[PDB]
Specification:
This is part of a larger assembly, with chains A, B, C and D. Chain B has 12 helices and 18 strands. By secondary structure, chain B is α+β, with helices and mostly antiparallel strands. Chain B is globular, with a radius of gyration of 24 Å. Chain C is α+β, with helices and mostly antiparallel strands. Chain C has 1 helix and 2 strands, in the order H-E-E. In chain C, strands 1-2 form a two-stranded antiparallel sheet. Chain C starts with a helix and ends in a 17-residue tail after the last strand. By secondary structure, chain D is an all-alpha fold. Classes of the chains: A alpha+beta, B alpha+beta, C alpha+beta, D mainly alpha. Chains in contact: A-B, A-C, A-D, B-C, B-D.
């Protein structure tokens, strides 16, 4: 292998992952947001922010670095974050080592403008020697031994569906849902509000709650039902009637208990109410009358495959993609999720056999994007990736 | 390979450095060498630096290389290792004179590291050990792992290492230190001192430090029976004290606990998490304060245990007056425990386990160095091939 | 005895430096620090016992 | 001749990708097996202690 050690940085819209290419896990996972506390001042890091957030001090406000595109939109802040990472976590001059960072799949447009802002940050400001940009869905797929794959990423910003054929990304078939993890935070909060008393500028408390009890609730209460929930209900009812009538147990009546710490208070949901939260990802027409069933994850996956079949047979691409389905993302770890994504895919494409792949290790999908970039950085040849040097920048600067 | 006479363990910390050369073979002994962690740095006109054990003719400056556990001066730190290492060679070379053919012929080194050390620092140290000290075999063992290996080898646990000015919190899952969860709070033993100064204004520092180190200072959660009790100055002066001797540990205990909670809550595999919460390991000088560990446990329970809120439970029991099943929660921890100490290291039992990290290293080094497999340390072979980078092919 | 010679007589051979390196395919336009192997051409003592516990 | 020559040209890079992709897949699979190995040797050392 090569005589080098890279810094690997992944700026997700929710989490930021950083570490060196020579070890199996990242040195740090910190929030892709910061507190601006006021003479201004910028707080980064999971415990630093949760401490400051709990202080409940006026003028403290949380801002974000990554928009819903998965792309950085506040570049002055991003530099401060990178400085923070290099200074306090990796503890190395940014000038020494090659850098590997991620971008999300796009349709192609915002690409050049981003690349430029990265030149300015990597070169003008940090003095990085050289960097590679890997495309998240692509790296994750490669890290998994796959050159062609339908990559279904369910993160905080929403679902990102990306067909990848023979190492190439099909941009026009790239699809980004708007409903994911962060959406789930909103719904858990709005729904539980009356039991916990509670029912931008108030960003600090929203954030702190999202990062504390709401995060635990998601990891322990929510489940995704295997089949359209409204149907599951009608069925379980229809069956329940017969057990009852017959003599003279509906699974949705099981209760689940969550200790809510801030008030030392038990919150009990029935299994249906637990299934209900993720149902919105699949049938978002159930919150507002302003969402079409087509904004739901099932129709969306289908849409993106069909748009893959338009290249540039279809019942071949369909077959390729569907035998290499990759399910990934923090939110994809919610119990029942893989199976519903599968059921939802299988019924839009009955003629085909689906085979899906997913990291089964809890940690590794939360940071599978970073894991992907890592396996790119450990590729044995410098010729395997585009490596931008200070040169490239100079030459772009000409007219 | 290898002679047990020859195994050298060094455990450097901000104030002092525990050292041992040779393992006893019968049972493990608590390290007897404790060298203050500092070196003198004379500056020689023309720019360069020289390093001595004493202020040479009052010409040298006093460098303290490790602060808050972090290496702040990597050059003085390596010079300090050499100073220790050389001293050991001289000592043994006198006493026995055939030493260079026996005890000093192949010296493997185990260096206990701290979570905060750079990769850059770890590589430089590796280079120093192979190039300057001309040693041939090196393990760099993280402090956290030494801890878990001493504690009857725990796959999942949490280390709470209470220093003087800071406390490290370090979760271990599947025998791996979880770097992204690791952290320290800027708070430790001195906090007790500080709490006490506020409670006893007319005392001074040495008086307060003496109380903390006395038989009558404990954390509560027979001495506790007496309103007042007595203890003796560093200088033999008798001092009486009231309820203050059961105070001063609280602010620290609460701070550590809040941190432990946020940390373990970010372990993603709940099945791992349950295990960690059931193997809390507390280490460091402070922890030898009577009552301290149990008090810290008590607080983790009070703050974090998942269990039915008492009022809720009291209603349900009234209702049933007209047997109550246990409410099951989806969260962890429903059980919190301190990891069980091994009781079969007699010398260690005698002296307490505040420094048990070192026993971790005595065990690992014997394992590793008295068995052929070279999987967990850097050898000359390896150094010759990859250099300091060799280090990353034997991480645990 | 001379500390340096004590170091020399115990435990019985390359050396590495941490420096700029410029990979090739000829040479890529960029640099980066790494641990390179060198070519052919590239104080005191303390008394333990004070520090022994007693 | 023109068409055949340009097609062989396209394939020189068709084969190029066939390789690039073949070798990346190789590294990726090797890296994954190395993870698993480290994880195993670790768990094995622990369980021996």
């Amino acid at each position: 292998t090569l005589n080098r050690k890279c810094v690997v940085i992944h700026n997700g819209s929710h989490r930021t992952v950083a570490g060196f290419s020579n070890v199996e896990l990242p040195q740090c996972i910190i929030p892709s947001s910061y507190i601006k506390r006021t003479e201004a001042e910028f707080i980064f890091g999971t415990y630093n922010m949760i401490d400051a957030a709990a202080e409940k001090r006026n003028g403290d406000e949380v801002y974000t670095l990554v928009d819903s595109q998965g792309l950085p939109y506040n570049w002055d802040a991003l530099e401060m974050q990178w400085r923070y990472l290099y200074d306090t976590q990796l503890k190395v001059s940014p000038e020494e080592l090659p850098l590997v960072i991620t971008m999300p799949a796009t349709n192609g447009k915002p690409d050049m403008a981003i690349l430029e802002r990265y030149y300015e940050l990597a070169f003008d400001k940090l003095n990085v020697p050289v960097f590679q940009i890997v495309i998240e869905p692509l790296a994750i797929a490669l890290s998994m031994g796959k050159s062609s794959a339908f990559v279904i990423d369910i993160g905080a910003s929403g679902c990102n569906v990306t067909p990848i054929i023979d190492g190439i990304v099909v941009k026009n078939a790239v699809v980004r849902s708007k409903f994911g993890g962060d959406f789930l935070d909103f719904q858990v909060h709005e729904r539980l509000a009356p039991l916990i008393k509670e029912e931008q500028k108030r960003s600090t408390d929203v954030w702190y709650e999202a990062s504390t009890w709401i995060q635990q609730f998601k990891s322990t209460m929510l489940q995704v039902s295997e089949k359209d929930l409204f149907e599951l209900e009608r069925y379980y009812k229809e069956q329940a009637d017969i057990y009852a009538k017959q003599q003279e147990n509906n699974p949705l009546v099981q209760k689940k208990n969550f200790l809510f710490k801030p008030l030392n208070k038990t919150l009990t949901l029935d299994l249906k109410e637990c299934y209900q939260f993720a149902e919105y990802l699949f049938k978002p027409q159930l919150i507002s009358d302003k969402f079409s069933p087509e904004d739901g994850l099932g129709p969306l996956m289908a849409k993106s495959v069909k748009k893959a079949g338009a290249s540039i047979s279809p019942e071949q691409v369909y077959s390729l993609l569907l035998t290499n389905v990759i399910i990934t993302g923090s939110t994809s770890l919610i119990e029942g999720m893989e199976q519903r994504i599968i059921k939802e895919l299988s019924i839009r494409f009955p003629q085909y056999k689906l085979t899906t792949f997913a990291n089964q290790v809890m940690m590794d999908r939360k940071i599978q994007g970073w894991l992907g970039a890592l396996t790119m950085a450990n590729l044995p040849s410098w010729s395997l990736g585009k490596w931008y040097s200070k040169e490239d920048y100079e030459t772009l600067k000409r007219d | 390979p290898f002679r047990q006479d020859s195994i050298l363990i060094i455990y450097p910390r901000s104030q002092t450095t525990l050292v041992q050369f040779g393992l006893n073979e019968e049972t493990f002994t608590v390290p007897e060498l404790e060298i203050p962690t500092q070196i003198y740095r004379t500056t020689r006109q023309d720019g360069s630096y020289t390093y001595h054990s004493t202020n040479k003719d009052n010409k040298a400056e006093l460098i303290k290389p490790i602060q808050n556990g972090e290496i702040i001066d990597i050059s003085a730190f390596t010079q300090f290792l050499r100073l220790i290492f050389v001293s050991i060679l001289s000592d043994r070379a006198n006493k026995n004179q055939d030493a260079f053919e026996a005890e000093l012929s192949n010296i493997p080194l185990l260096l206990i590291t701290h979570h905060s050390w750079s990769q850059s620092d770890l590589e430089i140290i590796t280079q120093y050990v192979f190039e300057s000290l001309e040693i041939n075999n090196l393990i760099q063992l993280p402090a956290s792992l030494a801890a878990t290996y001493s504690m009857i080898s725990l796959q999942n646990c949490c280390i709470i290492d209470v220093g003087t000015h800071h406390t490290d919190i370090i979760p271990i899952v599947d025998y791996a230190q979880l770097d992204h969860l690791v952290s320290s709070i800027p708070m430790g033993g001195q906090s007790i001192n500080d709490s006490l100064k506020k409670l006893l204004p007319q005392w001074d520092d040495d008086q307060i430090e003496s109380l903390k180190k006395s038989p009558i200072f404990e954390v509560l959660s027979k001495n506790s029976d007496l309103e007042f009790n007595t203890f003796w100055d560093e200088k033999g002066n008798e001092i009486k004290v009231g309820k203050q001797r059961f105070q001063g540990c609280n602010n620290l205990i609460k701070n550590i606990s809040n941190r432990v909670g946020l940390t373990l809550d970010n372990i993603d595999d709940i099945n791992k998490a349950k295990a960690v919460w059931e193997n809390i390991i507390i280490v460091g000088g402070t922890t030898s304060i009577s009552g301290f560990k149990e008090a810290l446990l008590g607080q983790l329970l009070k703050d974090h245990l998942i269990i039915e809120p008492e009022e809720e439970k009291s209603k349900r029991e009234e209702e049933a007056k007209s047997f109550v099943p246990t409410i099951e929660y989806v969260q962890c921890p429903t059980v919190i425990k301190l990891a069980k100490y091994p009781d079969y290291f007699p010398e260690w039992k005698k002296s307490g386990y505040s420094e048990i990290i070192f026993l971790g290293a005595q065990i690992v080094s014997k394992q590793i160095f008295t068995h052929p497999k070279d999987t967990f340390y850097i050898t000359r072979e390896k150094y010759n091939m990859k250099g300091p980078a060799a280090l990353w092919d034997v991480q645990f | 005895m001379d500390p340096q010679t004590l170091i020399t007589k115990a435990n019985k051979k390359e050396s590495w430096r941490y420096d700029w390196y410029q990979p090739s395919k000829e040479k890529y336009p960029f640099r980066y620090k790494t641990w390179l192997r060198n070519q052919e051409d590239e104080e005191d003592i303390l008394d333990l016992k004070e520090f022994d516990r007693r | 001749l023109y068409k055949n020559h340009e097609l062989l040209k396209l394939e020189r890079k068709k084969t190029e990708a066939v390789a690039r992709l073949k070798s990346m897949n190789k590294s990726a699979i090797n890296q994954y097996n190395r993870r698993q190995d480290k994880k195993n040797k670790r768990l094995k050392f622990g369980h021996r202690l």
